Symmetry: D2
Subunit: 240 residues, 4 copies
């Protein structure tokens, strides 16, 4: 039984990833920040479909809380086989109007979470000797940049760099490290004007669904994907 | 029943792709150039595992033959749902030593095959209105270049450009078009001394070659219904080379 | 002192590159295919500004003619220090409507020219021991793909792959090999209706076409002595398109 | 119009070389330093001795308030910068599981937060001056491809690339270009390697040598020039063919 931590599994892409990986047979750490009810709904659906998992909670910007909860989880249940670092936020504004909090909240939550969430999981993953899987969530904005989102583009591009560097370090230990960069996905995470501009750049002329992102995570998590590492794979309807 | 043409299915990556997609439930056009016995072995294994397929043959450098065989196949059996353009060759030498035939054979076979194989399949795929899948095989040398292979790097990079452009054209028709760029994969194509193999391994963080089956797993994902929003991509399966 | 061959120097980007590099002090091989008058105009402007150069001609799709002319030029004048492989064409159509000639003319002219033009220049460039510069012209379509241009995207992406591979081979010999990928540049190559131009502009953050002279400024940088550590790169000059 | 260019980390290495080259090109240089005042003065002395102009200034790029205060004062006193070269950076290497809190935070705060801290105060004035402008950031090959033992540095430097691209799109209509230079291995004080480690690094560089600071400065000079007005949103790598 291999366990997979999915951050932000209370809704959207994280929920869809949690459901799919549970169906694949992984035991899921259904993580949430504040939306306990949403996480329980995710878990209920996992269980009702014959899968297994459990709830856990932490703020990915809170380093100490991440370390404490994760060390406790690992002591009680053993090392994670997989870690899907999905939780993220956006705080959009034109660059010259971006507040201190807009910048810091996005960098601290989206980028520092790489260190806060993943670092406590690594030595135990290595210690278990089953190999492993690390999957991060970036964004097309991290690959190409996006107007009104200098902070988000920075954080999400930073995730890509972290992911690539860690891939090289862990390659000999049979742990793959990859990044999924979704384009525009239909979730709770913008104006009609902005949506139109986004659509015009999407050859498929539609948003992706959370379940489609989950299908890619399912592939990367599978045993047959063991030679895929250090990659950013974009699921974006042909945007780039 | 959706059919998938797999070029170069008589050995190596093409064989592995053929087997995997057959197991996924696709009816396979098991293509070969000259290795009929190899293609039959691929098909026998497909059938023995409860799948379906048929043999067909053409030179991917021979435009007229490709059109003739493919039009006949489509008239007799209906449009392909998927096309995996896998057939390829290498003719390595230092750039100043590369012969006319070294350059032309690699460009004509690897790059012109995009047009020769894929063009006859497109209007029928559109006409069938089931959407579709096009998967091309490039290489890490097409992404980053490789010494002693200016011809192969050129052809393989050209496949990437063709793939991306066609992706944009076919997006509204629910046909995805993607490229797989393997790194070093353990097949009959690769013939290296121990010294050369060590040099190659030093650039691969995983310190091993890929297996044909691993490349087939990625083709299987791209072929699946859940991958309908993935298009215009080059996905590299290379043990972390880049 | 140091000579630079600029293919397609009779108009557009090649002319602008020829003029700029001549102003930088390079002796220019002002190449043309059929537009002798245009090449002479380029040369007259070079000379009038205190620079030097000479006319030469060949079809970059004609391998034998390229070798013959270039071997003669090199025997008579010595090795080129730089080669700017700029000549190119487009033959646009939707992929299923692309004729045999549309595909072949674009691949043969744009991609085979890498081999036909550059190969005869390499051993002499090495033999001269002055180091060197090779600059190819690709396109944003070669980086990202472009609808209605599967052939051009393929050829231009192939140029990138060739360029990267040759860069690795020549690095120890102090010859840099790089690719310039312009976006939309205001030359005779571009023929768009007002409607099509607006669609193109909407994807360009700078909301204007580039000028040939801007592309020439980048070539001037890559040709300069201070750029000796830049190799294996595709540099895009495209107003922020990507 | 004498055009001024701020060069962070101009007291040594790449920043010094950029400062010298852009001064020779005719730009008035803000020769920035953090703690190495003597080094910055030597950069400025060489600028002046060669017939150029510039002035010293100082701030910690991790200190947001100090950056805003100094830069607003500089802009009030001398007018808007035409160019900003965000060059200052550090490395704090260790294997990912051994990386300390300070190793991670110092690299992210200094290398990535500096984009916001240094560049934001310069933008509205640059726009207000109506001369267009140039923003050049310094990333690294490790930001493009990742590098073992540097998950923090790779993250920060890749983050700079993303910030650079996004800002390029915002400022394109205002004739301010925004680009990133990603050097490979450059011979400065930042690099401290044993002979063994140097050999391993060289094996990945087709040119089999380190770059020189002056070479990086040549690329900055091109991007700063008027003829480079259509080049924006790019990461240009100067790395001897590494990638
Ligand atoms: N949607 C898109 O179009 C899109 C595009 C590109 C990339 N992405 C990336 O994909 C990931 C998920 O996106 P999504 O649209 O599914 O997000 P979403 O629906 O907005 O959900 C965000 C999730 O992250 C959690 N979260 C937010 N702040 C947190 C914090 N400080 N600590 C811990 N968890 C926190 C939330 O938990 P609670 O509800 O419990 O607070 C929630 O489950 C993000 O990294 C995002 O940047 C999304
Ligand atoms: N192996 C690697 O390391 C590697 C790495 C990156 C990319 N690739 C690419 O992956 C693809 C498959 O490679 P592989 O190693 O599986 O090759 P392989 O084992 O050598 O198989 C080559 C296949 O291509 C077919 N073929 C060759 N010339 C042909 C022609 N003119 N017309 C039609 N078919 C032709 C062959 O048919 P017959 O045997 O019937 O003659 C054979 O089935 C190629 O495109 C290759 O460039 C391979
Ligand atoms: N304009 C753009 O927006 C744009 C964008 C991206 C890339 N590019 C690339 O930039 C390069 C130059 O483009 P341009 O816009 O300056 O084109 P142009 O104005 O159409 O000039 C084309 C040049 O190519 C030469 N040429 C054409 N066919 C040839 C052949 N078979 N053999 C030898 N020479 C041949 C022509 O010679 P004659 O005049 O003697 O016939 C001419 O000098 C091309 O490689 C093109 O693909 C252009
Ligand atoms: N050298 C390489 O191989 C290489 C490769 C890729 C990228 N880079 C990048 O190139 C840039 C310059 O590198 P370099 O090798 O020239 O570095 P260097 O010789 O270490 O010089 C570093 C400069 O950064 C300044 N600095 C450091 N921390 C600072 C802070 N908190 N606030 C303000 N300024 C600070 C220093 O100021 P004081 O001296 O006054 O303290 C110094 O002038 C960096 O961003 C680096 O990451 C270097």
């Amino acid at each position: 039984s291999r366990s997979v931590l999915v951050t932000g599994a209370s809704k959207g892409i994280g929920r869809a990833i949690a459901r799919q990986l549970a169906a694949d047979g992984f035991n899921i750490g259904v993580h949430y920040h504040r939306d306990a009810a949403g996480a329980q709904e995710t878990l209920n659906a996992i269980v009702a479909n014959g899968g297994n998992g459990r709830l856990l909670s932490f703020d990915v910007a809170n380093r100490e809380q991440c370390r404490e909860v994760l060390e406790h989880e690992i002591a009680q249940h053993g090392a994670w086989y997989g870690v899907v670092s999905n939780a993220g936020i956006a705080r959009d504004a034109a660059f010259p109007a971006l507040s201190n909090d807009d910048w810091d909240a996005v960098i601290h939550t989206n980028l520092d979470s790489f260190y806060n969430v993943i670092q406590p999981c690594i030595m135990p993953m290595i210690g278990a000797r089953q190999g492993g899987r690390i999957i991060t969530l970036s964004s097309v904005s991290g690959v190409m940049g996006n107007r009104g989102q200098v902070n988000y583009s920075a954080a999400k591009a930073g995730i890509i760099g972290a992911t690539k560097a860690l891939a090289i370090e862990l390659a000999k230990r049979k742990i793959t490290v990859n990044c999924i960069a979704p384009g525009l996905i239909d979730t709770g995470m913008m104006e009609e004007s902005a949506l139109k501009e986004a659509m015009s750049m999407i050859p498929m002329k539609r948003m992706g669904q959370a379940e489609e992102v989950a299908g890619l995570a399912s592939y990367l998590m599978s045993d047959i994907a063991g030679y895929v590492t250090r990659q950013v794979i974009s699921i974006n309807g042909g945007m780039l």
